[PDB]
A paper describes a structure:
Sickle cell disease (SCD) is a prevalent life-threatening hemoglobinopathy characterized by a point mutation in the β-chain of hemoglobin. Indeed, S1P-conjugated beads successfully pulled down HbA and HbS from normal and SCD patients erythrocyte lysates, while sphingosine or lysophosphatidic acid beads cannot, indicating that S1P directly and specifically binds to both human HbA and HbS in erythrocyte lysates. P50 of purified HbA or HbS in the presence of 2,3-BPG along with S1P revealed that S1P decreased HbA and HbS-O2 binding affinity in a dose-dependent manner. Thus, we provide biochemical and functional evidence that S1P binds directly to Hb but requires co-binding of 2,3-BPG to decrease O2 binding affinity, presumably by further stabilizing deoxyHb and increasing its T-state character.
Expectedly, and consistent with published studies, we observed 2,3-BPG bound in two alternate conformations at the dyad axis of the β-cleft in the ternary deoxyHbA-S1P-2,3-BPG complex to tie together the two β-subunits via interactions with the residues βHis2, βLys82, βAsn139, and βHis143 from both β-subunits (intermolecular interactions) in symmetry-related fashion. In both the binary deoxyHbA-S1P and ternary deoxyHbA-S1P-2,3-BPG complexes, S1P was observed bound in the central water cavity, with the phosphate and the amide moieties located in a pocket formed by α1Lys99, α1His103, β1Asn108, β1Tyr35 and β1Gln131, while the flexible aliphatic long chain snaked toward the β-cleft making hydrophobic interactions with α1 Phe36, α1Ser35, β1Lys132, β1Gln131, β1Ala135, β1Val1 and β1His2. Binding of 2,3-BPG might have increased the affinity of the protein for S1P in the central water cavity. Interestingly, besides the central water cavity bound S1P we also found two additional S1P molecules bound in a symmetry-related fashion at the surface of the deoxyHbA-S1P-2,3-BPG complex but not in the deoxyHbA-S1P complex, indicating that 2,3-BPG binding most likely is required for S1P binding at the surface of the protein. Specifically, the phosphate moiety binds close to the α1-heme and located in a highly positive environment formed by α1Arg92, β2Arg40, α1His45, and α1Lys90, as well as with β2Glu43; either making direct salt-bridge/hydrogen-bond interactions and/or water-mediated hydrogen-bond interactions with these residues. The side-chains of both β2Glu43 and α1Lys90 have moved from their native positions to make interactions with the S1P. The highly flexible aliphatic chain snaked along a shallow cavity wall making hydrophobic interactions with the so-called “switch region” residues of β2Phe41, α1Thr41, α1Pro44, β2Leu96, β2His97, as well as with β2-heme, like a molecular sticky tape.
Numbering used by the authors:
A (entry chain A), B (entry chain C): 1 to 141
C (entry chain D), D (entry chain B): 1 to 146
Write the structure that this text describes.
Amino acid sequence: VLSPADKTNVKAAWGKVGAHAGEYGAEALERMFLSFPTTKTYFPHFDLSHGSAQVKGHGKKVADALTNAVAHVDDMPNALSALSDLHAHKLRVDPVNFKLLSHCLLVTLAAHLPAEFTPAVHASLDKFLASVSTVLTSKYR
Amino acid sequence: VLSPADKTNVKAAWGKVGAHAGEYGAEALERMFLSFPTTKTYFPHFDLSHGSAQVKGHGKKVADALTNAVAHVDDMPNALSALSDLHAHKLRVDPVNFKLLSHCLLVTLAAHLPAEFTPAVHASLDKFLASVSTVLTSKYR
Amino acid sequence: VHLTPEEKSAVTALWGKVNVDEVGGEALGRLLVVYPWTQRFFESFGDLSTPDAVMGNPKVKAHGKKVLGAFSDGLAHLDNLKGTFATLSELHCDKLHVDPENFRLLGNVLVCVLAHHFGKEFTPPVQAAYQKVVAGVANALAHKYH
Amino acid sequence: VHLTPEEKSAVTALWGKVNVDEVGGEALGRLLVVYPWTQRFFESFGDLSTPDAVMGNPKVKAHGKKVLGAFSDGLAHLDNLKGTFATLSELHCDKLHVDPENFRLLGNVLVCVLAHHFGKEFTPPVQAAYQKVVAGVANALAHKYH
Ligand code: HEM
Ligand code: HEM
Ligand code: HEM
Ligand code: HEM
Ligand SMILES: CCCCCCCCCCCCC/C=C\[C@@H](O)[C@@H](N)COP(=O)(O)O
Ligand SMILES: O=C(O)[C@@H](COP(=O)(O)O)OP(=O)(O)O
């Protein structure tokens, strides 16, 4: 569960992301594909080369979903309902992969938010991404 | 989340386990220690030899907690509250280990329940043990 | 894999009592029932909507025999699993796009199936030997991923 | 998957710019804050009740420096990680009773700290090389467990 402190920490850090959201999402994806190539098994229909427009486009979608989750942190299950339906019934990404993208998102944030990425915020963001991952895999079976 | 059918399946299988719960808990522990040696790091104070009284005693405790969870299957977070506090604040067993003991419990039940360990029951018991594990690590941070 | 001579013998002694075709169908079928997201690679297999629909699905059974038949042949080459599974590794990555985590889940389902079928004979030490085997096979199938 | 010559060069070039004292303290500190259950091995270190107490704790900093110091020395043996960490592996298992999963969590935290410190220079390719490095080190420290 996310404590009041976690919510405040997440809102502050993500708020700083601002117009860079799509950029950071795309960067996080690239880091994941390079660091953990098995995650590429889910995007055989994508050009995964650097600068790929498909990756950039997907990075934006992922970032917007996270923004939506932050804005509705008190009720993420309902806010992300269609998204959890999509991953459970269609995409069916193995649950093990979510921590991989979560880790890469954290790395991306650390690389771009030197002042805001304090140990407490890092902890809050890790918990937050875990919560989002849990909601997204909640309908799997 | 456990569906009505999942609960019917768990109650049927655990009901057949009956008086052998403690023995099965002990067997599950022996299987875990042998197949996944790293789990032994949590029991340096134990005589982990085959048939040791400490493993038998601990197996009984684990099995009893599972029996309690089954008896309160629609209220597990509350029924396992004290146990969740204990693992989170004191024992602090890394979360990755719960799937290891759960796997060994399933193996133990498969080896002892030839008639009832059907594919559907297997599926329901895997979800049940995952639910119990989630509850037991829910207060970790 | 790091099996002791006594574990390699245990593995082979038990496997010689296994009906590979049957166990293959049972393990693949249980994988699809227990972890339903794995059905994502079998959209051409037809009805997989209920446990019986999956377990008795003739294509699931046929594929199970193919999969475990290869696993079985791999057991005759425990000292060279990466080499023996090299082309199947390349195929699963480049053509089938199968997340290697699926090999690990199948391995755990296989261990549960062996315990179910053999009962008490599937002792704790015997299980430990088989856990090393399924992990080794899974690692060999994941080796050529890139 | 080991390191390509280029990846090895990437690792060493970045590491030559690392203040191991600071990165070590920061890494262990963040480990105890982000995954608090890891505090179970350090009850004699004193106050670890808040993020500031953990990061400022002198024993946490002293231990972070010791641990990362050993990690640093290991980087000179990238071709024989198991051999160079063998005694430490046996020690963490037999005397310290440290679940090797802890090595993987520290690895994750270390990557985040390197990214925090280097910013844009910690590029995706550089991250990938370091991910191979921390996995290899964790695997080496876990190798002698029994
Ligand atoms: C932080 C967790 C994640 C979030 C917030 C997330 C969010 C999303 C969103 C917003 C979409 C677009 C849906 C649409 O078209 O309307 C999507 C699609 C998808 N996601 Fe997830 N996702 C996450 C993790 C994952 C992971 C771990 C993978 C796999 C490694 C993954 C693979 C996919 C794939 C393959 C698609 C389809 C993209 C396409 O075909 O264009 N997702 N996800
Ligand atoms: C199926 C999930 C699990 C259940 C139901 C469970 C249940 C319990 C129970 C009932 C106790 C006794 C508490 C008391 O004395 O009141 C306990 C203690 C303990 N558990 Fe858990 N546990 C689970 C998983 C784990 C795992 C995965 C590990 C580590 C591999 C673990 C390690 C311990 C340790 C070391 C203790 C203390 C034993 C002692 O000092 O006597 N538990 N657990
Ligand atoms: C012990 C591990 C496994 C072995 C040894 C194995 C072996 C094989 C073999 C021999 C084939 C035929 C290759 C061909 O068509 O040329 C095959 C095909 C295939 N395998 Fe694997 N496999 C394993 C695990 C899995 C798992 C767990 C999945 C995913 C849930 C999977 C999905 C597939 C798919 C989709 C095909 C193609 C089926 C089709 O023809 O439509 N495999 N595998
Ligand atoms: C990169 C991984 C790590 C390396 C290379 C490493 C290295 C070391 C070294 C060099 C020592 C001194 C051994 C001696 O006395 O001869 C040590 C002690 C210790 N390490 Fe590790 N370690 C690592 C990760 C960890 C982690 C993640 C934990 C647990 C969260 C841990 C817990 C301990 C403990 C409790 C001690 C004993 C401290 C004391 O003397 O009070 N280590 N480690
Ligand atoms: C020669 C025999 C060929 C048949 C073998 C079948 C292999 C199955 C294909 C593996 C799928 C690659 C992953 C594709 C991406 C998906 O995650 C989503 N785009 C769509 O969801 P989703 O497609 O998962 O619903
Ligand atoms: O050093 C190595 O070649 C292997 C040892 O494993 P085995 O080949 O003995 O199974 O390391 P790993 O690929 O597991 O990281």
